[PDB]
DNA sequence: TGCACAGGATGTATATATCTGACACGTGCCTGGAGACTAGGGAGTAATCCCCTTGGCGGTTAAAACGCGGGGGACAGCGCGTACGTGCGTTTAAGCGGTGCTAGAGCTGTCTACGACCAATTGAGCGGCCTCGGCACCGGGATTCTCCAGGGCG
């Protein structure tokens, strides 16, 4: 979810981010895909919308 | 001699004159009915401001909700005996008729304290405020307080 687990976690596992709906994306939505892209990812991140 | 009868000698409901009690009707003096003047208390309005809502997403917590074991307490059954229920005779005392009283209950003038009604002052009491020492909540630790397992004892 956006507010619960889409804010501070470390997950490096997924290579893809999917967004069903985005209300605010100056910042708040940018954090969601940045939960995916991290230091431990050696693969390019493909982010859809 | 045993017996029926004709009339008196008592009862008894029956019908008549008589004694309370309560409804019904005819008054006149403290009530109501009503007319006019004053006026302040009630009906009506103009802001107002002020706390009280509008509508619904999520995240999380504390409180509400459900589920089972069983332990003890509600609860049915049943025997006992003494404690009132029921029935007599015997007594003390209230009900009631009647009486002599009085001392307190009950309606009415006097005036006189004495409280109702109305200006003038103010100060003690109410709106406003802003602090700190008592209060709210919880840790530390000692203390008590109940729960469960032998075992020494039946
Ligand atoms: Mg961080």
Descriptive tags:
ATPase, 49 residues, 14% helix, 1 helix, 2 strands, Helicase SWR1, nuclear protein, DNA-binding, 1 chains, two-stranded parallel ribbon, little secondary structure, Remodeller, binds magnesium ion, Chromatin
How would you describe this structure to a colleague?
The protein is largely without helices or strands. The protein has one helix at 30-36; strands spanning 16-17, 46-47. The protein is globular, with a radius of gyration of 10 Å. It binds magnesium ion (MG). The structure holds one DNA strand of 154 nucleotides. It is found in: Nucleus. This is Helicase SWR1.
Describe the structure concisely for a colleague:
It is classed as nuclear protein. By secondary structure, this protein is mostly loops.
Per-chain topology:
Blueprint (H helix, E strand, L loop, with lengths): L15 E2 L12 H7 L9 E2 L2
Parallel strand pairs: 1-2
The protein binds one DNA strand of 154 nucleotides through loops.
PDB class: nuclear protein
Keywords: Chromatin, Remodeller, ATPase, Histone, nuclear protein
Entry title: Chromatin remodeller-nucleosome complex at 3.6 A resolution.
């Amino acid at each position: 979810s956006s507010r619960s687990g889409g804010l501070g976690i470390n997950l490096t596992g997924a290579d893809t981010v999917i967004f069903y709906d985005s209300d605010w994306n100056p910042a708040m939505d940018k954090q969601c895909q940045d939960r995916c892209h991290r230091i431990g990812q050696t693969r390019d991140v493909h982010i859809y919308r």
